[PDB]
Write a protein that binds this ligand. Structure first.
Ligand SMILES: [Ca+2]
Length: 559
């Protein structure tokens, strides 16, 4: 160790030291003065910023690969270590101040944690191959797949903790990981594959079966095509034209008409999501505004949905099956956040995934021609299937559910692990994690069109069965109305870090988590706060008082 004061500029610059991975190169080790708050970020304390890369190499596609990291260690340190999760197919290196999600302004660094981030083992500015669908092109390299699946977060966690020990002269007392989406998958993977890396984990909207997302995507694309109107430049139906924003709002209003009050309170929120799934069928549901059937009896009017539309969304929500009827992913919850109107602005946060923007002459859904479909083809199918960007939608339209779904379990050539092997995080063996004191908070918006909230619930049910008493270390918070990680007519904003630290360090399990709406105009109000309830509980109004105030609600079993 350098004979210099700990936690100082001197100790920072001396990191540019033996690393757990001999192939670690530090490119930056710089002292940063305290930064004031901005409109979008809390103030950052004085700190050491360390950035570099691990395992620089050349892939079998001829491209350069490395695991980049950025670490920030505050001079005034609370003894805790924090890693933030990724997003999408990763490939970018964030500012690494420790995002906590939930629409929060504060970062973990602003709360005096040491914080770290990674790009997951590839770089969107370098591994952008125009012959292999752009920034998903890292899928052409077998090791870059393993790095994306698990290896990068492992290497960066070890490197960050080694830097922390050198800079401060002691290890962190407790370590925390927070991620949403791909980041939620990472958090579940860590609890399963690397249980001693983190003591507290928050996994939001976790893509723990991400290789199956493109299977759902082909299925929702083919389900919706009969309701499409018009064609894109490649002659493929415009899936975005299958439902206007007004059409989706009608569907959302019919869901509310059937389902809103099944929790006891008409408030634009379906808290009793299980009762909703048992009750709602758009082929038989009424439009509550006039009592007529939601499904048109004759020609299409602005107050009804065509039979073709109703068949299409019903099929899409049912989930993919093979020709023998076996489910290949899961079903999706009917929920009011499939739409929403705030002022004159329709919610886009559900429809962007399977349909895309209505006002476009091209397909732009994530699952039709977008990043999710591209990622399935190049990253999760084995062997990879690179192709022109203009062929992706056609490939989804021609997807064969007896043949193509098998490719996420296959190996081939140098791809010696399947994508479900390296990217899936489906194990419920959390004994090692639980026994060392680990705590996990899962959350998921009911109107998430990327990953099914009901599939997260099914994982949690399997966890509870495998490990009796699981609510002692792992709880799931479902959020009615919320879309993918944020947005929608629900209480989508919350501070998950504060209850996580309370659970890990004071044993105080979260019996509720306070939340508020980022867009309370969806309900025509200035603010709405509600408790998030641990599965299977839901929020129950006490029977009087302002329905927009959390104090008038409690968590309870459904009616
Ligand atoms: Ca309600």
């Amino acid at each position: 160790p350098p004979p210099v004061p700990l936690a100082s500029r001197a100790a920072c610059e001396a990191l540019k030291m033996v690393w757990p991975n001999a192939a670690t190169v530090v490119e930056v080790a710089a002292w940063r003065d305290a930064a004031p708050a901005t409109a979008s970020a809390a103030a950052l304390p004085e700190h050491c910023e360390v950035s570099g890369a691990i395992a620089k190499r050349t892939g079998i596609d001829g491209y350069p690969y490395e695991i980049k990291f950025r670490l920030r260690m505050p001079a005034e340190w609370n003894g805790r270590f924090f890693m933030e999760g990724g997003s999408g197919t990763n490939g970018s290196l964030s500012a690494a101040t420790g995002s906590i999600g939930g629409g929060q302004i504060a970062s973990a660094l602003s709360r005096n944690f040491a914080t770290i981030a990674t790009d997951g083992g590839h770089d969107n500015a370098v591994n952008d191959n125009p012959d292999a669908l752009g920034t998903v092109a890292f899928g052409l390299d077998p090791q870059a797949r393993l790095d994306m699946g698990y290896n990068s977060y492992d290497q960066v966690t070890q490197a960050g903790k080694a830097a922390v020990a050198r800079f401060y002269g002691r290890a962190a007392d407790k370590s925390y990981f927070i991620g949403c989406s791909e980041g939620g998958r990472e958090g579940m993977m860590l609890s399963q594959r690397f249980p001693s890396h983190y003591d507290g984990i928050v996994a939001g909207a976790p893509g723990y079966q991400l290789p199956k997302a493109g299977i759902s995507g082909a299925w929702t694309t083919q389900s919706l095509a009969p309701a499409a109107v018009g064609l894109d430049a490649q002659g493929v139906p415009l899936i975005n034209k299958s439902f206007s924003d007004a059409d989706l709002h009608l569907l959302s209003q019919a869901i509310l008409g059937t389902c809103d009050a099944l929790d006891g309170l008409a408030d634009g929120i379906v808290d009793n999501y299980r009762a909703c799934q048992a009750a709602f069928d758009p082929a038989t549901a009424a439009n509550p505004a006039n009592g007529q059937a939601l499904q048109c009896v004759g020609a299409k009017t602005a107050d009804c949905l065509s039979p073709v539309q109703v068949t299409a969304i019903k099929r899409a929500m049912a989930g993919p099956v093979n020709s023998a009827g076996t489910p290949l992913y899961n079903r999706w919850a009917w929920d009011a956040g499939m739409s929403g109107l705030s002022g004159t602005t329709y919610n886009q946060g559900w429809r962007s995934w399977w349909l895309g923007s209505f006002n476009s002459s091209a397909n732009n859904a994530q699952r039709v021609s977008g990043f999710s479909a591209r990622s399935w083809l190049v990253d999760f199918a084995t062997p990879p299937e690179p192709m022109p960007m203009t062929q992706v939608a056609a490939r989804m339209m021609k997807f064969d559910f007896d043949i193509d779904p098998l490719k996420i379990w296959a190996t081939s050539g140098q791809f010696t692990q399947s994508s479900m092997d390296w990217h899936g995080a489906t194990s419920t063996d959390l004994a090692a994690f639980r026994d060392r004191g680990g705590k996990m908070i899962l959350y998921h918006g009911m109107s998430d069109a990327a990953f099914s909230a009901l599939d997260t619930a099914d994982y949690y049910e399997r966890l509870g069965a495998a490990m009796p008493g699981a609510a002692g270390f792992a709880r799931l918070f479902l959020v009615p109305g919320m879309n993918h990680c944020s947005g929608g007519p629900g209480t989508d904003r919350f501070d998950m870090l504060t209850p996580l630290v309370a659970w890990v360090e004071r044993g105080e399990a979260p019996d509720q988590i306070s939340a508020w709406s980022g867009t309370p105009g969806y309900f025509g109000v200035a603010a709405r706060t509600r408790p998030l309830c641990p599965y299977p509980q839901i929020a129950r109004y006490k029977g009087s008082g302002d329905i927009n105030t959390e104090a008038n609600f409690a968590c309870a079993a459904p009616p």
